[PDB]
From Swiss-Prot, chains A, B:
Binds 8 Mg(2+) ions per integrase homotetramer. Zn(2+) can also be a cofactor for the nicking activity, but not for the polynucleotidyltransferase activity. This is Integrase. The gene is gag-pol. Catalyzes viral DNA integration into the host chromosome, by performing a series of DNA cutting and joining reactions. This recombination event is an essential step in the viral replication cycle. Has a strong preference for using the 3'-OH at the viral DNA end as a nucleophile. The chain holds residues 1334 to 1479 of 1603 of the full protein. Homodimer; further associates as a homooctamer.
Amino acid sequence: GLGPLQIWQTDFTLEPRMAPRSWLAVTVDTASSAIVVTQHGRVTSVAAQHHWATAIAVLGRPKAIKTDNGSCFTSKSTREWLARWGIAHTTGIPGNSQGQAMVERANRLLKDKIRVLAEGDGFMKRIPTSKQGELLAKAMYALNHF
Amino acid sequence: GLGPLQIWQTDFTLEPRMAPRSWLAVTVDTASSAIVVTQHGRVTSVAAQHHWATAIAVLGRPKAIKTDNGSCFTSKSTREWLARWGIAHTTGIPGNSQGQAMVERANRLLKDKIRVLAEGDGFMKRIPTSKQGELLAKAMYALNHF
């Protein structure tokens, strides 16, 4: 089984063009570099668990998840959720090259795409709430199935 | 490129354990048999487009989509949406073995899983609204990453 290991990096990034639910939770699969993004109203332990529930259905269950020391990732709640799934978890510093670099690069790529696509449709500022989901799904498609 | 063609089958199926948004839109990738499911409040042209927007981000853009003659799939709206993406579309009869059998089998598998999982958590009837998303994502994971 010489193929690659199954480890992700996850963080939150603020995108006001997607308000009211302007917090994007972004996951990078470090082996393949596939990106899963979901949209959230607030950053909480539960918004992190919901996102990972989506990412699992999209990429399959990983062996480990690399995050920073954000409370939504260190809460007893989340720790329990991860243990319930059997996914090892490893923290880091906000910006720990070690295990936050890939996903920081990915936040930037994702925001760029969102802007380029939003402006092509004539949305200079905020994206109409009813357009946001299809537009976010198209930015994900682009960055993955490029 | 002797590997398989990229064609999907899509339909809607009613699941009251997921009310208020009890309409599940289900897509089968006929080659790999991967399943994408989303949750909807009503079956309309727009709910079909939203679901396919999600499926594209998950499976990539297909060449063709097999559906029945449901209006939400034959509306001028949807026809436009599909053309905008360049996805050929082919209709059928509600239950046309030709191109509705795979996805009918999949509705049944999905409802079974939802029931088995819901009852394991102690939900005999309706699933608490706040549990529905993670539970639907876990039923998808199971049926795909089995």
